[PDB]
Amino acid sequence: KRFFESYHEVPDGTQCHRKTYITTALGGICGIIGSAYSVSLNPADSTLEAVARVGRYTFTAAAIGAMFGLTTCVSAQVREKPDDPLNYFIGGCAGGLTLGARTHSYGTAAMGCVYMGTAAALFKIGKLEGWELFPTPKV
Amino acid sequence: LDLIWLEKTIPKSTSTLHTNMTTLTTNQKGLIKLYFMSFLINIILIIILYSINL
Amino acid sequence: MNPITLAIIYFTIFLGPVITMSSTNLMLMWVGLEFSLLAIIPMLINKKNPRSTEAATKYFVTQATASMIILLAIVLNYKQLGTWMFQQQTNGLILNMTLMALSMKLGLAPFHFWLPEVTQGIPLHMGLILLTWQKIAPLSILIQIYPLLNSTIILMLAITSIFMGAWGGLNQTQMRKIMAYSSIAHMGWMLAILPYNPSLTLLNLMIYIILTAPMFMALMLNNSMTINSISLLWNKTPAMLTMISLMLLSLGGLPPLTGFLPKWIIITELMKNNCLIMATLMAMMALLNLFFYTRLIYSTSLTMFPTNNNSKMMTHQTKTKPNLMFSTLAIMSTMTLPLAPQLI
Amino acid sequence: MNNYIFVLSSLFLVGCLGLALKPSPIYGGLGLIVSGFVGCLMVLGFGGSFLGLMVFLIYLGGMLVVFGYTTAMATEEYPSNWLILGFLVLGVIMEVFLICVLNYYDGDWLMYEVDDVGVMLEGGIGVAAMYSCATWMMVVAGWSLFAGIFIIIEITR
Amino acid sequence: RYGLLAAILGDKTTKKLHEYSRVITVDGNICSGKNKLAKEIAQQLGMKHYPEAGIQYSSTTTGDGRPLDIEFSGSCSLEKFYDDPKSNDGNSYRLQSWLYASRLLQYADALEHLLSTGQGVVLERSIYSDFVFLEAMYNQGYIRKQCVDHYNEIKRLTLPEYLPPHAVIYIDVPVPEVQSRIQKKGDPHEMKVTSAYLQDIENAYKKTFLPKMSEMCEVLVYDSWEAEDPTKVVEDIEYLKYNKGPWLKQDDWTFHYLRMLVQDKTEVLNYTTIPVYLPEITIGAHQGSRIYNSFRELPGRKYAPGYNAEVGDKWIWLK
Amino acid sequence: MPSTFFNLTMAFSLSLLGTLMFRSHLMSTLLCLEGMVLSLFIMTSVTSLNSNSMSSMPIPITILVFAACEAAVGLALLVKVSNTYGTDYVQNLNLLQ
Amino acid sequence: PFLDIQKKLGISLDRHFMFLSAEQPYKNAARCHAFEKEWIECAHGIGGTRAKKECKIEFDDFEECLLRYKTMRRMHDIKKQREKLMKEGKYTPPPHHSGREEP
Amino acid sequence: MMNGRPGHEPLKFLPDEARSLPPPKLNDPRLVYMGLLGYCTGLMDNMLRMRPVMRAGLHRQLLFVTSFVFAGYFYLKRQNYLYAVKDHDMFGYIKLHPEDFPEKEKKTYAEILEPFHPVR
Ligand SMILES: CCCCCCCCCCCCCCCCCC(=O)OC[C@H](COP(=O)(O)OCCN)OC(=O)CCCCCCCCCCCCCCCCC
Ligand SMILES: Nc1ncnc2c1ncn2[C@@H]1O[C@H](COP(=O)(O)OP(=O)(O)O)[C@@H](O)[C@H]1O
């Protein structure tokens, strides 16, 4: 776990390799989990068919992970701005686009871009403003 | 811009996004085995959620 | 049912939650849970229709394995602390088990599959008990142990439930299952504030009970398990159309009615505790719940669906009345909001 | 003997492994019956004579028998236990390998502590506490049995 | 009221049953003289003789009991049934569906009298013997296939709950006989009933109804000659042994629940109003709302029995 | 018990994995379900015995008494199912979809 | 607990036997009875939030009377290294292992 | 929360300490609301049971308006206490742990210099 966290430690826009790798893993992990629920429920017809679906979901998710990581990191270096939430939006923007492609739908890319990017941007803001998620009870 | 573009984007899209999401989450075989394994998956993930955030 | 059996069962279904609540020795809390499991199964198959046996056999397996997991937590604690009860020191995994298990008996989040299906095959009456006098028991166990449970998991099960409940409800047209889905959702809010302010869980429950109990006795007054069936309410009994309208919008969070308070104070408590991430997303999809509530509103009240000639016959005959509880629980529920400060 | 217990514990896991792979339900009957034998012995290793014979007496022949009993009456329509044995054998070995992991890293503390000069030490005096100083466990167990007779007739009808 | 409380303390149908206490229906063709046989059998054992179910039987059942206006009673005409078969509006199916609801009310009222008083009941035609009219109507152009399915669905949903007729006295008089019998009591409408339709009614009686109830209940058939001799038929009923049938298992604690059902008319026909939208059955919201505002405004109906002052109810301010 | 309470615990998890993944006959679950109660009974009895905590021995048995009835209910449902569907096979239990 | 019908009614059907130091039959004291007392008379009047930091000496000890793992560890080490000393033929079990014994 | 407080009455409704607090005026708007809340319950019942809405059950109407109100005085009497305990508890802590809740000096605006954003 010390791993994933690393993504945040080094300043954004720097060491994109590690960023992309980490982001790709998270997506892939989600892919596995997502495929699992998708196979446990709404099962397949043959073991192979399901192994394929696991692969499909895993790769698609890994891809959205990569492009998000790559776009955000690169957008940063190029723009010479490491804390501009927009960076992430461009990244989320891209991530959605990959999802759209893997689903072969321009429309999905639309919602995907907006919704996904917005979400990622909010993550950046969240980190920048020190928003706390799942907080301990401090009443 | 009125009618189609400003109705397909904000009002209608949100209509579709959900409609589609309910279709996947609610299309369930009804068989117990499937459902139960999903309980298995959950136990596994929660076991981990605790593990990694030990 | 030989009235004697009816008494023994009903006593057990009622001694079941009460032992849980009163005792402190967890073991005695477990058997309280066990007695509830044994007592409910006979009533569930009263019609003994093919759907029913399916319902009970699912409810029982889901309930039984969860009961065994809760016992394992108590057995493990016994070896990590000689005590028969969770303490500050308790290993975190020990408590998380209890959360998952108890979240299965209550049917929250990723374990929300059994409830909608058992709510579909049981009568409207036993539906109420299965939804509201069987949630008191497990919740008691959680509320007692709140200081120790994890804020992260609860929140995830909370948010998930809200979403699953909402999304599931949108598609459903069977009423029993629309309610099952709502209960999953409300149950979610309840478990969201447990780690922070248990006292509000007990409000978000009572209000749910004071809202759902009138709503179901409404569904059965005409015994309609279909929206199409509840839509012809205007012909079968016109007066309940007014309050059915407000109670369902009350079940969702719309502001003038009593239903806003549970969501409002839960949001106030979560923001007081800084979960302005979590609280926001919950409130937003909470709005999805009202959409399916209002879609039913449309069919039952705001628009008059076509009815059948044979209905004129049912009008002629005197309609067996709805118990008094309906009224007292419809009003105390639809409009108590002006009295919120004292409720909390 | 040596590791008189670990061995047994290992057998308990093995039996339950069988049940988990859902052997044919009356081939699975033994699975429990035999581990139940194993667990009977285990508790009899820590000096728990009464509790140990209590299971052998109740879960072994009372609960489990009745199970298979019904297992034959109903659900006797069965077409792979061999396949199961395959996984059983492999998993059993995998279980061993896992222990071999402890060999890589991490009994003198079996019976733990006792009162050597004593009478009124035997386990089983405790179970009788249901009547003195623990008479609420006894009543609730009694209500469950009384409820069971009424509940089952109502389930069966 | 009747409830577990009453049942717990006595009030058991078990203590109120006697040999003469049975559900006996007599079924025949459009004119089997069953009306006569019924009254007599009734006179013999003091059996409450229920009249055949009518369009306004429910109105006579409820409140004042004065006959309701046709549209208030579901707008059904047996008269129009005959003069306009295969009508565009489908009055014939609406007539049949209202008839099934009426006998459902009659059968339930009969069972309530049987379990409370203990007296038996002769109900002439019953929900059990209604299908023959629909079978003949579908065999003819009168009703279409789905119409049949809708009636069958209502029948499957409601009829099983009620216990079967103990015995089902039956008359038979060949189609020629009935047509001729029609001519004697002259009525333009009843007169124009295509024989083949009468052929289909009796047929469905003999081929499907007569045997079907023969296992579950005592079917005794009586040719016309045996008929018109209530004494003999009555004698035979008193002769048959009420053994074979589902009635054997009706213990007191089982009857209680059945009683509480018939005790609630709103439930008896709960499934009679199922929201299946076949076009003939549909009230329609605008027409239905008007008929309701108008049926509900009739004196003594605007409020529950006992509370409407128009008909002379008093003490409303303390009820 | 340090590693003798890990075998029993994993036995309960192996029994856990069992009850949660069904396959054909329902009896095998119920039967499995019982495998847990045995593992819980054995573990409760074991620690109570090496803690010399005699005040708690009542529990090891209360666990069995409640588990037995629990199973009684479970089997009556099972008999009810192979009376309505002629088999205990779970697939049949898919009407509530 | 959630509804204290027990304290109110004064009855104690469920409290007398919750800890190892409760009355054991025939007064056969449990094990770790030397500590649980010391760890619950400490945390009495002090709520949990403060029964978890300052009364940590008594739980760290009671976590060792029962689990008795540090002992297991120490001893295991003694065993392993003794194996190594025997390995170097340095050590041999004393006649204590086979010698005249006390009554 | 407030449970676990010293002296807590384990199952009591309103401890006698609540005697010290003023009793709720019977005409307190709230109790009067409960009254109206009640009358409506009554009227609603009549309606759902199809009775003359206002002219029926004039005995029940009273039971309702008088049951709800009765409940109120004794509930409000308590909720009032609970809130009053909250202050006793809250104010006390502010003192017993004074340093944590220190009095602050607020510089007269003359001294403080909030920046001025011009609208222009
Ligand atoms: C906080 C304010 C919230 C909003 C307040 C105003 C809206 C209240 C909620 C209304 C919701 C339902 C709307 C649609 C109802 C449709 C009813 C209908 O179609 O009519 C039939 C119905 C039953 O007819 P029936 O009474 O049996 O006929 C008797 C014949 N002798 O006819 C009836 O049911 C008649 C009786 C209806 C109940 C009376 C409603 C009166 C209006 C209530 C206003 C409350 C104002 C509160 C203001 C608060 C300010 C802070
Ligand atoms: N379910 C039904 N559908 C259509 N017509 C019916 C139905 N039940 C009864 N009738 C009609 O009612 C008429 C009178 O029946 P009945 O009382 O037997 O005649 P009578 O009084 O001359 O003996 C018959 O002509 C018959 O067609």
From Swiss-Prot, chain B:
Location of this chain's protein in the cell: Mitochondrion inner membrane
Origin, by domain of life?
A: Eukaryota
Q: Which residues cross the membrane?
A: 34-54
What protein family does this chain belong to? Answer: Belongs to the complex I subunit 5 family.
Oligomeric and partner information: Core subunit of respiratory chain NADH dehydrogenase (Complex I) which is composed of 45 different subunits.
Give the protein's function.
Core subunit of the mitochondrial membrane respiratory chain NADH dehydrogenase (Complex I) which catalyzes electron transfer from NADH through the respiratory chain, using ubiquinone as an electron acceptor. Essential for the catalytic activity and assembly of complex I.
Q: What is this protein called?
A: NADH-ubiquinone oxidoreductase chain 5
From Swiss-Prot, chain C:
Which parts pass through the membrane? 1-21, 25-45, 56-76, 92-114, 149-171, 178-198, 200-220, 241-261, 274-294, 324-344
Keywords assigned by UniProt?
Answer: Electron transport, Membrane, Mitochondrion, Mitochondrion inner membrane, NAD, Respiratory chain, Translocase, Transmembrane, Transmembrane helix, Transport, Ubiquinone
Q: Does the keyword tRNA processing apply?
A: no
* GO process annotations (BP): aerobic respiration; mitochondrial electron transport, NADH to ubiquinone; mitochondrial respiratory chain complex I assembly; proton motive force-driven mitochondrial ATP synthesis; reactive oxygen species metabolic process
Stated EC number for the protein is 7.1.1.2
What reaction does this catalyse?
a ubiquinone + NADH + 5 H(+)(in) = a ubiquinol + NAD(+) + 4 H(+)(out)
Please, which domain of life does this record's source organism belong to? Eukaryota
Q: Which InterPro entries match?
A: Complex_I_Subunit_2 (IPR050175), NADH_DH_su2_C (IPR010933), NADH_UbQ_OxRdtase_chain2 (IPR003917), ND/Mrp_TM (IPR001750)
Record bears the keyword NAD: yes
Q: Where in the cell is it found?
A: Mitochondrion inner membrane
Q: Name one GO cellular component term.
A: mitochondrial inner membrane
Note the coiled coil stretches, chain numbering: none
What the entry lists under Pfam families is as follows: NADH_dehy_S2_C (PF06444), Proton_antipo_M (PF00361)
- How does the entry describe its membrane topology? Multi-pass membrane protein
Class in the EC hierarchy, top level: translocase
Spell out the molecular function terms from Gene Ontology: NADH dehydrogenase (ubiquinone) activity
Q: Its principal location?
A: mitochondrion
Family per record: Belongs to the complex I subunit 2 family.
Please explain the role this protein plays, according to its UniProt record: Core subunit of the mitochondrial membrane respiratory chain NADH dehydrogenase (Complex I) which catalyzes electron transfer from NADH through the respiratory chain, using ubiquinone as an electron acceptor. Essential for the catalytic activity and assembly of complex I.
Protein name, UniProt field: NADH-ubiquinone oxidoreductase chain 2
Recorded source organism is: Mus musculus
UniProtKB/Swiss-Prot annotation, chain E:
Q: Where in the cell is it found?
A: Mitochondrion matrix
Q: Does the keyword Oxidoreductase apply?
A: no
GO terms, molecular function: NADH dehydrogenase (ubiquinone) activity
Q: Which parts form a coiled-coil structure per UniProt?
A: none
Q: Lineage, please? A: Eukaryota, Metazoa, Chordata, Craniata, Vertebrata
How does it get modified after it is made? Phosphorylation at Ser-214 by PINK1 is required for the binding and/or reduction of the complex I substrate ubiquinone.
Residues recorded as bearing N6-acetyllysine in the entry = 86
Briefly state the protein's biological role. Answer: Accessory subunit of the mitochondrial membrane respiratory chain NADH dehydrogenase (Complex I), that is believed not to be involved in catalysis. Complex I functions in the transfer of electrons from NADH to the respiratory chain. The immediate electron acceptor for the enzyme is believed to be ubiquinone.
Instruction: List the protein's name.
Output: NADH dehydrogenase [ubiquinone] 1 alpha subcomplex subunit 10, mitochondrial
The entry describes its oligomerization and partners as: Complex I is composed of 45 different subunits. This a component of the hydrophobic protein fraction.
Instruction: Please give the family membership noted in the entry.
Output: Belongs to the complex I NDUFA10 subunit family.
Q: Does the keyword Transport apply?
A: yes
Q: Name one GO biological process term.
A: proton motive force-driven mitochondrial ATP synthesis
Question: Entry's InterPro entries?
Answer: Deoxyribonucleoside_kinase (IPR050566), DNK_dom (IPR031314), NDUFA10 (IPR015828), P-loop_NTPase (IPR027417)
- Residue numbers carrying N6-succinyllysine: 86, 249
This protein's major location comes to mitochondrion
| A Pfam family annotated for this UniProt entry | dNK
Point out residues bearing the modification Phosphoserine: 214
Q: Name one GO cellular component term.
A: mitochondrial matrix
Give the highest taxon in the source lineage: Eukaryota
Q: How is the cofactor bound?
A: Binds 1 FAD per subunit.
Swiss-Prot record, chain F:
Write down the chemical reaction(s) this protein catalyses.
a ubiquinone + NADH + 5 H(+)(in) = a ubiquinol + NAD(+) + 4 H(+)(out)
Asked if the record carries the keyword Electron transport, the reply is yes
Gene3D superfamilies from the UniProt entry: 1.10.287.3510
One Pfam match: Oxidored_q2
Entry's Gene Ontology cellular component terms: mitochondrial inner membrane; mitochondrion; respiratory chain complex I
What this protein is reported to do is described as: Core subunit of the mitochondrial membrane respiratory chain NADH dehydrogenase (Complex I) which catalyzes electron transfer from NADH through the respiratory chain, using ubiquinone as an electron acceptor. Part of the enzyme membrane arm which is embedded in the lipid bilayer and involved in proton translocation.
Name this protein carries in UniProt: NADH-ubiquinone oxidoreductase chain 4L
Origin species: Mus musculus (Mouse)
What gene codes for this chain?
Answer: Mtnd4l
